[PDB]
Structure formats: C-alpha cells, structure tokens
C-alpha cells in the first residue's frame, strides 16, 4: 500500500509499505530513498511519535496516510 | 520523570558533551571532562571505526535541509574543536559504547502547530524512538538524560533528588 511522508522542509515522499512493516523498516525505506540514516529520523502520526518495534498496523496507519518526518535536533 | 529538571550547559559548541558530562556524573558517579569526551570520539574514529560511523558523518541531514559531510580523517581533528557540535546519533552512540550507558534525549519539535516533546533512547547499537512501549527508565543509574528545546542548544536533564 502507498503512504506519504512530509518533511518540515515541505517535501512529500511516497513509500510502498505493508501494514506489518515495523517503524524501523519504514525508516530504512526512507534511508533508501533520501539517504537519511534511520537514527536521524523521527516519524509522527496523528500527533504521536511512532515507536521502533511497533508496526504501522499497531498505529492504525492505513493506505494514503501522511506521516511527518522530523529529524534529530542539533545543538551547541 | 517528575523529579527531573532542566539544568544548564556551557554556552559554546561543547554543550552536547557538557550536558552528557553532567548527567553521567549524577547517574554513574564518573567525572569526565567535556574535552575527554571529545577525545573519546577522536579515539573511536582513529581505531578502525565501523561502517556505520563513516556513513553517518558523510550523511548528516537536519530539519533545515543543510547536508553536512566530512571524512573520518578530518573528523579526528575536527571533533577536538569546541566549534564542532556533538550529535546524539553519532557522538552519543560512541559515548554510550564507551561508558556502557543509554542516552535519553528529549527533543521539542512542532508539527502542524502541535508542540511535541519527542523521546529518544540511544545506545551502542543505535537509536530508537521511545514512549509508551519502549519506556525510558527514570530510575536506571545507567541511563543519562539531556534535552534539546530546539534552540540549537543541549542541556542536561538532572535529578533534583541528587
């Protein structure tokens, strides 16, 4: 199924995922497309941070959902 | 969680290391200088570092779209400069391995006008987004705690009890 990921810079990424995909898998897919190491990524859906070790289905994320990608904060 | 407050870190580019240093001292009792922490990262980079580290420092992204990249050889001198900021996902992972601790980071970010405090748990193998199922242990002496309020500065998160 297809989901969307929106960055704070305004970029929309499309991903092909399955309901059983873990959040780790989704971040790896974003690494594959965007070069962003998973440890720099955080994913937000419906106002909540998605936890590694859980699946998209666990969060009721269905086709054509938009997740928000926000990255590690630097400082300093 | 309730007994933790935001402390203060030095106001130069070593604030990541200074925040780590203050929390490590309260949690594990070990007193380390910020400069020693930087040397810990220099030594890691000199001693045949793994592919995860080479790949991270050539692929640093941020929320502004600034891509940063440098070689391992240049990192070994750069990481000793106070101007070179420390990142939880690189320097934090290195220090977690060195000191056998986990690193809890709170990051304040805003999405669609909703302020969030994001919790992350870093250890020697990488970083995980934490919360309700991957819980931060606020009674673990081997977890250190820092916060980034989104103003390009790290502060330690300390236990008012100690």
Residue numbers in the entry:
A (entry chain M): 1 to 76
B (entry chain A): 39 to 200
Give the authors' words.
As anticipated, the Ub C‐terminus was found to be covalently linked to the wMelOTU catalytic Cys. Firstly, not only did Ub binding shift the His‐loop up into position that opens entry into the active site, but in doing so it aligned the catalytic triad to facilitate nucleophilic attack. The second major insight from the wMelOTU‐Ub structure is the mode of Ub binding, which is very distinct from anything observed in previous OTU studies. The two regions of missing density in the apo wMelOTU structure are ordered in the Ub‐bound complex as two β‐hairpins that wrap around the Ub, forming an embrace (and EV3C). Together with additional interactions from a loop extending off the edge of the central β‐sheet, wMelOTU forms a tripartite S1 site that becomes stabilized upon substrate binding. Although this S1 site is on a similar surface of the OTU domain, the distinctive recognition elements (to be discussed in a broader context below) position the bound Ub moiety in a drastically different orientation that is 107° or 167° rotated from the vOTU‐Ub or OTUB1:Ub structures, respectively. The primary hairpin extends from the central β‐sheet and forms hydrophobic interactions with the I44 hydrophobic patch of Ub. The secondary β‐hairpin replaces what is typically a helical arm in other OTUs and contacts the Ub I36 hydrophobic patch with H99.
We have predicted and validated a set of OTU deubiquitinases encoded by several classes of pathogenic bacteria. By determining the ubiquitin‐bound structures of two examples, we demonstrate the novel strategies that have evolved to both thread an OTU fold and recognize a ubiquitin substrate. Our new bacterial OTU DUB structures allowed for the first cross‐kingdom structural analysis, from which we established a framework for identifying evolutionary adaptations in the S1 substrate‐binding site that impart DUB activity.
